[PDB]
Amino acid sequence: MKILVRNLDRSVTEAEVLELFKAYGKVESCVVVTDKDTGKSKGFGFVEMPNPREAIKAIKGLNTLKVKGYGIRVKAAE
């Protein structure tokens, strides 16, 4: 399952996001975009968890979690 992550602070790192999704299951890939072209609020990420039941658990678990002061938004790409 492909998972979309939004509202990332420019200080959020790929390893930070990875550690969060790994609380829920196996993570096959984690792409995080926090540039200066994104704002300290509008970074985004794309996470692949191959077990869809783990992905769903992570979506429910992590959506609206504050990371660096912004509630992140997590949902399936589909």
Numbering used by the authors: 19 to 96
List passages from the publication reporting this PDB structure.
Here, we identified an RRM-containing protein in Acinetobacter baumannii that we called AB-Elavl, starting from a protein similarity search with the human ELAV-like protein HuR. The single RRM domain is characterized by the presence of two consensus sequences: a highly conserved sequence (RNP1) of eight amino acids and a less conserved sequence of six (RNP2). The typical secondary structure consists of a β1α1β2β3α2β4 topology and the RNP1 and RNP2 are localized in the internal β1β3 strands. All these results suggest that A. baumannii express an RRM-containing RBP that shares RNA-binding properties and characteristics with the human HuR for the ability to bind RNA AU-rich region, although with lower affinity and specificity.
The crystals diffracted up to 1.6 Å resolution: they belong to space group I41 with one molecule in the asymmetric unit, a solvent content of about 50%, and a mosaicity of 0.3°. The X-ray structure showed the domain of an RRM domain: β1-α1-β2-β3-α2-β4 with an additional β5 segment present right before the C-terminus of the protein. The two conserved amino acid sequences, ILVNRL and KGFGFVE, are localized at the level of the two internal strands of the β-sheet: β2-β3. The solved structure shows the absence of the first 18 residues in the electron density with respect to the cloned sequence. It is not trivial to tell whether this is due to their high mobility or rather to their loss due to some protein degradation before/during crystallization. It appears quite clear that the fold of rAB-Elavl is very similar to that of the model used for structure solution and, in turn, similar to the typical RRM. The greatest discrepancy between the two structures is in the region involving residues from 50 to 58, just before RNP-1. In our case electron density is missing for those residues, confirming thus very high mobility. The average B-factor along the sequence is, in fact, about 35 Å2, confirming an overall rigidity of the structure, with the only exception being the above-mentioned region 50–58 where temperature factor values are extremely high. The structure of the bacterial RRM domain appears very similar to the eukaryotic one but for the presence of an additional short β strand and a more flexible central region.
